[PDB]
């Protein structure tokens, strides 16, 4: 496996930070940090930095902002080919924090991935991407039905199809599709959730999902397939704390080893490598994510369990 497409989101996501004490319910001098973000873009950008040929389809504006995301597609070496509305503005996620880094309010405006519907997803030039692709990879940011339809294709076209959960809320919208998922990224939330930690395959296969990932707090998590389990021990002294992020990296890590046709025990132990590199100081991100990167950090990661 080495081309992996990504269908999901990608969005501008906008800081602008208050540079002296706040005032409440009135205007505050600030100064506006912009990045590019979503789930499956920043999935797709640790693929790419882990040595995979990377295309990502997203429902994209006809913005300076939606050039933003795709300058940072092009900086990860991913292929940006953007379901484009000319006429729309590209999804957005602006936060407002104090001096402090306190998050006083957040605004997202995702409607434009509601374009994204099954009869888009079925037009020749998609089935065309996902001919050409090893592995699929999706977020439930698209609609439900979306999701499904994709399933179907996957189905259709032989190509494993992997998600990442996004939210609780989100969740749910891959319930049909999961018949037709390889494997689903989820932390606990989303996993209760899409559902109604060595327990969540039994539940989870008979809800239809053949693999997934779940995770909880810093060092728990949970790996499944078709007719195996594994788990991650607890750490030593001299190993990694923390082998969990926003969920990117440890998506981006476990999916890595399957596609090399590596053990789930080996695909959890390299997922939260991943994870613990973005998340090992505050100034660390899936910007650090390598071959080598993962590489160094993994004699640190706790060894797995087959259950
Ligand atoms: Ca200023
Ligand atoms: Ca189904
Ligand atoms: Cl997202
Ligand atoms: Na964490």
Same mark, same amino acid.
């Given at each position: 496996?080495? /081309? ?5 989101? *990608? ?10 004490? #706040? ?34 389809? +997203? ?10 995301? *795709? ?7 991913? @292929? ?33 991935? =509601? ?28 609609? @439900? ?27 749910? /919208?891959?319930? +049909? ?40 707090? +810093?060092?728990?998590?949970? *790996? ?35 596609? @090399?046709? =590596? ?12 994870? +613990?590199? #973005? ?11 390598? =071959? ?16």
């Amino acid at each position: 496996m080495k /081309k992996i497409l990504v269908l999901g989101g *990608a969005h501008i996501d906008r800081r602008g930070m208050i540079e002296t004490e #706040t005032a409440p319910g009135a205007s505050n001098p600030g100064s506006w940090m912009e990045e590019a973000g979503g789930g499956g873009f920043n999935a797709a950008r640790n693929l790419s930095r882990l040595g995979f040929e990377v295309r990502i389809i +997203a429902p994209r504006g006809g913005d300076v902002t939606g050039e933003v995301v *795709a300058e940072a597609a092009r900086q990860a070496g991913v @292929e940006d080919t953007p379901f484009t509305f000319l006429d729309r503005r590209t999804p957005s996620y602006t936060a407002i924090l104090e001096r402090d880094g306190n998050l006083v309010i957040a605004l997202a405006d995702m409607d434009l991935y =509601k374009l994204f519907t099954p009869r888009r997803l079925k037009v020749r030039a998609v089935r065309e991407a996902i001919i050409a692709s090893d592995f699929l990879l999706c977020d439930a940011n698209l609609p @439900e039905d979306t999701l499904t339809a994709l399933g179907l294709i996957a189905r259709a076209c032989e190509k494993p199809l992997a998600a990442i959960a996004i939210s609780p809320a989100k969740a749910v /919208k891959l319930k +049909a599709a999961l018949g037709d998922i390889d494997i689903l990224f989820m932390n606990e939330a989303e996993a209760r959730a899409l559902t109604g930690v060595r327990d969540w395959p039994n539940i989870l296969r008979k809800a239809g999902l053949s693999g997934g990932v779940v995770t909880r707090g +810093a060092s728990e998590v949970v *790996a499944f397939n078709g007719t195996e389990k594994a788990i991650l021990h607890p750490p030593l002294i001299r190993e990694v704390k923390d082998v969990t992020g926003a969920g990117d990296a440890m998506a981006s890590g476990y999916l890595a080893a399957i596609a @090399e046709g =590596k053990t789930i025990r080996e695909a959890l132990r390299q997922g939260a490598a991943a994870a +613990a590199i #973005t998340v090992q100081s505050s100034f660390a991100t899936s910007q650090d994510l390598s =071959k080598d990167s993962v590489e160094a950090m993994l004699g640190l990661v706790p060894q797995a369990e087959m259950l």
